[PDB]
Design goal:
It is found in: Secreted. This is Killer toxin HM-1. Keywords: Cleavage on pair of basic residues, Disulfide bond, Secreted, Signal, Toxin. The chain is mainly β and 88 residues long. The protein has a single domain (1-88), classed as Sandwich (Gamma-B Crystallin, domain 1), CATH 2.60.20.20. Helices cover 0% and strands 34% of the residues. It has strands at 5-8, 28-29, 36-39, 48-53, 62-67, 71-74, 83-86. The strands form two sheets. It has a four-stranded antiparallel beta sheet with strand order 2-7-4-5, with no helix packed on it. The protein has a three-stranded antiparallel beta sheet with strand order 1-3-6, with no helix packed on it. Strand 4 (48-53) and strand 5 form a beta hairpin.
Length: 88
């Protein structure tokens, strides 16, 4: 339960240290075993989506990647990923 827009090292916040920084409308840099956006029931129905960047500090190439609410979503792209900023 509880809304959130965190991401994780595994598919499971129970057994993986997910980062609980704010992510909504911020240029957050990521890496190091982090490859799962595991998104909560924030607005249960309303997916969480992000623009996700190649660069550290949201420069470089990007994807815009969406996933539904209460869904564990493995980030693998056609590039390395480092930053993101949400979009919904």
């Amino acid at each position: 339960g509880d809304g959130y827009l965190i991401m994780c090292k595994n598919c499971d916040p129970n057994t993986g240290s997910c980062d609980w920084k704010q992510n909504w409308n911020t240029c957050v840099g990521i890496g190091a075993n982090v490859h799962w956006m595991v998104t909560g029931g924030s607005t249960d129905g309303k997916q969480g989506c992000a623009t996700i960047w190649e660069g550290s500090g949201c420069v470089g190439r990007s994807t815009t990647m969406c996933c539904p609410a209460n869904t564990c979503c493995n980030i693998n792209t056609g590039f390395y990923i480092r930053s993101y900023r949400r979009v919904e």
